[PDB]
Amino acid sequence: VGWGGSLQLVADMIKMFFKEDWIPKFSDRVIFTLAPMIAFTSLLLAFAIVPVSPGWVVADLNIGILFFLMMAGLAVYAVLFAGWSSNNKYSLLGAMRASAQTLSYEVFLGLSLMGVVAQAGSFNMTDIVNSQAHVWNVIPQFFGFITFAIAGVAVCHRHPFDQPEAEQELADGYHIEYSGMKFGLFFVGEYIGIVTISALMVTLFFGGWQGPLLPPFIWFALKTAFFMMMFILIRASLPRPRYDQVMSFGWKICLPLTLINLLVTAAVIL
Amino acid sequence: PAWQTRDHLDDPVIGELRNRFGPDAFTVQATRTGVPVVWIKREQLLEVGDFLKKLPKPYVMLFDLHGMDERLRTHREGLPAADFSVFYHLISIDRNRDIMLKVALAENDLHVPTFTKLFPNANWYERETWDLFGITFDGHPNLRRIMMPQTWKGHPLRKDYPARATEFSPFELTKAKQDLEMEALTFKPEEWGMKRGTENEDFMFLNLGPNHPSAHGAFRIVLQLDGEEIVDCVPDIGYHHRGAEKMGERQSWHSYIPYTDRIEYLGGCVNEMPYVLAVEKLAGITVPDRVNVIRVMLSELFRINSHLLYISTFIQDVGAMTPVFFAFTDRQKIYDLVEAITGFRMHPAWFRIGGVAHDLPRGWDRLLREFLDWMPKRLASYEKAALQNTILKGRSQGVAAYGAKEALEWGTTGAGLRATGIDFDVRKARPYSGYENFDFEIPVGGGVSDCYTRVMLKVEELRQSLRILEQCLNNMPEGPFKADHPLTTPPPKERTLQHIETLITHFLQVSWGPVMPANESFQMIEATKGINSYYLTSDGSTMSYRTRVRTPSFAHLQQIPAAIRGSLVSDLIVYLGSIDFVMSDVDR
Amino acid sequence: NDMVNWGRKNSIWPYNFGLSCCYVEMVTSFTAVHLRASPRQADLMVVAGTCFTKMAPVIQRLYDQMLEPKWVISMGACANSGGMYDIYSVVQGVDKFIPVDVYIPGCPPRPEAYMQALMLLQESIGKEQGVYRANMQSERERKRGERIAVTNLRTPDEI
Amino acid sequence: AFAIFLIVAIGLCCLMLVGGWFLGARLRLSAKFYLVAMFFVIFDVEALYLFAWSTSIRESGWVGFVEAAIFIFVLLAGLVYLVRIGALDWTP
Numbered sequence A: 001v002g003w004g005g006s007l008q009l010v011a012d013m014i015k016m017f018f019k020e021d022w023i024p025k026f027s028d029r030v031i032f033t034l035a036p037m038i039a040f041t042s043l044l045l046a047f048a049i050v051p052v053s054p055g056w057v058v059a060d061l062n063i064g065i066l067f068f069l070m071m072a073g074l075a076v077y078a079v080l081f082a083g084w085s086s087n088n089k090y091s092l093l094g095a096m097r098a099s100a101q102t103l104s105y106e107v108f109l110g111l112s113l114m115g116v117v118a119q120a121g122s123f124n125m126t127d128i129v130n131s132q133a134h135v136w137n138v139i140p141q142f143f144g145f146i147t148f149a150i151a152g153v154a155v156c157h158r159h160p161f162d163q164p165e166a167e168q169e170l171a172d173g174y175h176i177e178y179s180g181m182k183f184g185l186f187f188v189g190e191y192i193g194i195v196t197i198s199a200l201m202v203t204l205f206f207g208g209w210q211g212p213l214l215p216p217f218i219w220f221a222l223k224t225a226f227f228m229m230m231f232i233l234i235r236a237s238l239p240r241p242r243y244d245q246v247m248s249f250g251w252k253i254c255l256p257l258t259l260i261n262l263l264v265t266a267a268v269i270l
Numbered sequence B: 001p002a003w004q005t006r007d008h009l010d011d012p013v014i015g016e017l018r019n020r021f022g023p024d025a026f027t028v029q030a031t032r033t034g035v036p037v038v039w040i041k042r043e044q045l046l047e048v049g050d051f052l053k054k055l056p057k058p059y060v061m062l063f064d065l066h067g068m069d070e071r072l073r074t075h076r077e078g079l080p081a082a083d084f085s086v087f088y089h090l091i092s093i094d095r096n097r098d099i100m101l102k103v104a105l106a107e108n109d110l111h112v113p114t115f116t117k118l119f120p121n122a123n124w125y126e127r128e129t130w131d132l133f134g135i136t137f138d139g140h141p142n143l144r145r146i147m148m149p150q151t152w153k154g155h156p157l158r159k160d161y162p163a164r165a166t167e168f169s170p171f172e173l174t175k176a177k178q179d180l181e182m183e184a185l186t187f188k189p190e191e192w193g194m195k196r197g198t199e200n201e202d203f204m205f206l207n208l209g210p211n212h213p214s215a216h217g218a219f220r221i222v223l224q225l226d227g228e229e230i231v232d233c234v235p236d237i238g239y240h241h242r243g244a245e246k247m248g249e250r251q252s253w254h255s256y257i258p259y260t261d262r263i264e265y266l267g268g269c270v271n272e273m274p275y276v277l278a279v280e281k282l283a284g285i286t287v288p289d290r291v292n293v294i295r296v297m298l299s300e301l302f303r304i305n306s307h308l309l310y311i312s313t314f315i316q317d318v319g320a321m322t323p324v325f326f327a328f329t330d331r332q333k334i335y336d337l338v339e340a341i342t343g344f345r346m347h348p349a350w351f352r353i354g355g356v357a358h359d360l361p362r363g364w365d366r367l368l369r370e371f372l373d374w375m376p377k378r379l380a381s382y383e384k385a386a387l388q389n390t391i392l393k394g395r396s397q398g399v400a401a402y403g404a405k406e407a408l409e410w411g412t413t414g415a416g417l418r419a420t421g422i423d424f425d426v427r428k429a430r431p432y433s434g435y436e437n438f439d440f441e442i443p444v445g446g447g448v449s450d451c452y453t454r455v456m457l458k459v460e461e462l463r464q465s466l467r468i469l470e471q472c473l474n475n476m477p478e479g480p481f482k483a484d485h486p487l488t489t490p491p492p493k494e495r496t497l498q499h500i501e502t503l504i505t506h507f508l509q510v511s512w513g514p515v516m517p518a519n520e521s522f523q524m525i526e527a528t529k530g531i532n533s534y535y536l537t538s539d540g541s542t543m544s545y546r547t548r549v550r551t552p553s554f555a556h557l558q559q560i561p562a563a564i565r566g567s568l569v570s571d572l573i574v575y576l577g578s579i580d581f582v583m584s585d586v587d588r
Numbered sequence C: 001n002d003m004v005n006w007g008r009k010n011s012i013w014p015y016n017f018g019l020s021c022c023y024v025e026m027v028t029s030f031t032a033v034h035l036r037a038s039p040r041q042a043d044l045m046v047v048a049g050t051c052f053t054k055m056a057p058v059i060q061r062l063y064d065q066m067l068e069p070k071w072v073i074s075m076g077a078c079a080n081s082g083g084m085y086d087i088y089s090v091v092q093g094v095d096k097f098i099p100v101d102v103y104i105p106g107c108p109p110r111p112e113a114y115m116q117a118l119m120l121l122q123e124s125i126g127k128e129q130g131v132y133r134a135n136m137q138s139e140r141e142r143k144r145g146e147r148i149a150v151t152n153l154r155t156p157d158e159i
Numbered sequence D: 001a002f003a004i005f006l007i008v009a010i011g012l013c014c015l016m017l018v019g020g021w022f023l024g025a026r027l028r029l030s031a032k033f034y035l036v037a038m039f040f041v042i043f044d045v046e047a048l049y050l051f052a053w054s055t056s057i058r059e060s061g062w063v064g065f066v067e068a069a070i071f072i073f074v075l076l077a078g079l080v081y082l083v084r085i086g087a088l089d090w091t092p
Ligand code: SF4
Pocket: B262, C021, C022, C023, C048, C049, C050, C075, C076, C077, C078, C079, C083, C106, C107, C108, C109
């Protein structure tokens, strides 16, 4: 039997290849093609700002944080042009409610990231990875860390669980009208999304490239693997939350939490 | 005996109707239904029913309305000359009595005034009579075909209609292309019921056919929407029609028993109990006490399983499904006991006329005792998890509620009707299968029937069923598992393997069938959902002449349009989940 | 190389079309083996339950919607044939109007039968419909000498 | 650099898409109530000032914390206003 966890996803990709493509009638054609890469390329290029090595850095640009927020905001357009390209009021309203809770729960990550970039004081990722040299920026900011966790898992990572189905009748999940390679493109996109959120979390919250007794790149890789397993553990443990309860625990509870979080970090940093 | 042929002429209702109308018109039939069967010409039916409706203790609920062919009955002594008949079974709860009314019709003039004005739940019943027979009910609002498609020529319950598919042309897809063209051109002519609203921007037509889980079968409910309101909901039923009633005519009394198990997939031996009780009423068989206790044990086990499925699914759809999935493991244990007794997990087909198929295997008591001691702690964990929860409780209050009168007019029985203040169980009012030797209580909801009240009552009934099952474990008596009577089918097998006369009885009983003399029997039981009954008529042969299966889910699904009018689509879906309806039961 | 064949054996997407009855055992199997199954995304359709003349166009539209590589598992006697319901209102098998690949007798079949259905279907999927001049061997013929050699069974008066 | 990685990514996109091709009126009550998203459109603009703020706070000091507290207090007053009037509530 197959011994590797990734080989199942590999076979899934093989399966999506060589499948006949049908044209949709009474549909727009340019967005039907362009909507997959708005979901894929965003979290693909979210990987372009990680300091995997000082000598093998993929991009030595001055700002990486703002690019990450730009991808966070950009992701919504994939659910919107997918909703309009569904060309069925059912599916369109399903994607409208999915984009609703998406825009609703994407607010928190930037304000949660303000704490770590304020105690770091720079946008160049070399400064952040050199800041976590002895003390990581997770001990004081527990609330900011969990708020960024909720926000990162809330951006189309399936934790809300309103993507392929709809609690509300008169509408339907928006993953139905795509059946060619685009559905595999969606899955591989969320896969690079979860691994890139984990990598950004480890290299921005915890200390990357430390190397206590072993070479630091495999130290980063193993820590990323532990956070991968913990993310999968809590994603599976996380039950489906209906639309209402998600709206209830959104703007009410965590906007004050992040505002007092910014107050606490600004009071303690000086 | 409880099987002897009675006329019931002495019953007070018969004498009140005799006083009111004097002599003539009424012919009191002799049957083993247990109820008074009266013939009433079709020109006085509406008058007669009205008198019964307003009588000082009225017959508030129309239990059943259907027709009989009656053309091929050779033994017709005492009945008037009829080519067709329509029977109306009515029940007075305050009298705890029943009455059956039979209107005779001739083959050239199949016309009778509609009865829906008195009882609204008769509307679908009359539609079924138009569909399966060819009686036209003049004055019916929407007299269309409710079971077969709208182009189906022929009335399938007539005896000149060949029953089996083999007599028709096989699925050559000549008609599949026409059904494809019809389905592709899905348009609304506004003939699907009243459809007062016009098809424009003001009103939106939505099939809203739930194929998702917890739908309890795939069905369509065409809905007219205005302001996200249910202007008119029209179910399109009949997709799961299996022709069980027609199947009863071409099968022997013994070989039909498997077909009973599939009227309701979750019922199992509950569905078999009324059939065997009616057949033994035709045979005149009194079973031993051990047969009664065994049947009570299997029926309470299946009732517990069905109630646990209803609770689990209810908590899953409108609540937290993490803990109640442990009931799935518990349901497996109830199943390992059923296949320990009967043999197979679902559709046991284990009940026989006069007894059961085998004796209990010798290790049944220890398994049942281990399940009965282990279960109560879990049952109390579910009781705390469901009585004390707040989120679904707040959600599940006042959601499409109805009262006693509303349930009565809509024929609704079971947990729906018990949620109101009417204390009416059939296991106490009309004891059957030895329930009168057991101690159990009937929980009641008060005066408001909603989704929380129904589940709380089902939990209380499940606790009383567990008390019945412990009384079955502690008071199971000793003796035979089959009655001693020549119509007990089959005979005890060890007797068959050694004795020539028992071998001959077994030979003719399993091959030609047992010969039941020409008479009519009727039994109703409390089922897992509502009240389920079987009205069997034998013409003296080894097969049924007429088999009528009254399923409560048909009435429960008929009731939704009266209560859901003035609600949202979400309230509709929640109500559909709450109501105890299964498509197999609605379409038999 | 046959890497493409390996891709389809390793991973399959099931579309559960179980009807009124016969689906409680299928659910028993599915909740142990496995919201992922979606219309117009699956390549496997496990038709269960009694196929009726009235709702057969629904099954034909769902069959048409799926992609070019189509697999169908019939489970139960009610889906393989008409089963016990040889009546005017039931079509005598889902194989009358859609091609079927695997037949799983029973009423209802067991979850282990579903497991053996996936094993026989990956076996057919790994030989390329999958005849390949290897499928003439039949389960009636393969385990015949296994089944005939059985002599003693437990007496039915015990648990 | 970033340009090389972008060229690699767009070349991979062209390779996958080309390979894929070779392989072969009235809404009434429905929708509406996007005003949570309009609240986001305005609140992202409010939080962009904190986006510019987060780079330089050590040289800002006590008056900086004071008027940042005033700013987020104004935002909090607006938020509780929208909550208490019923604008920010359950939404379809
Ligand atoms: S195979 Fe058995 S369980 Fe399935 S539908 Fe047919 S009779 Fe019911």
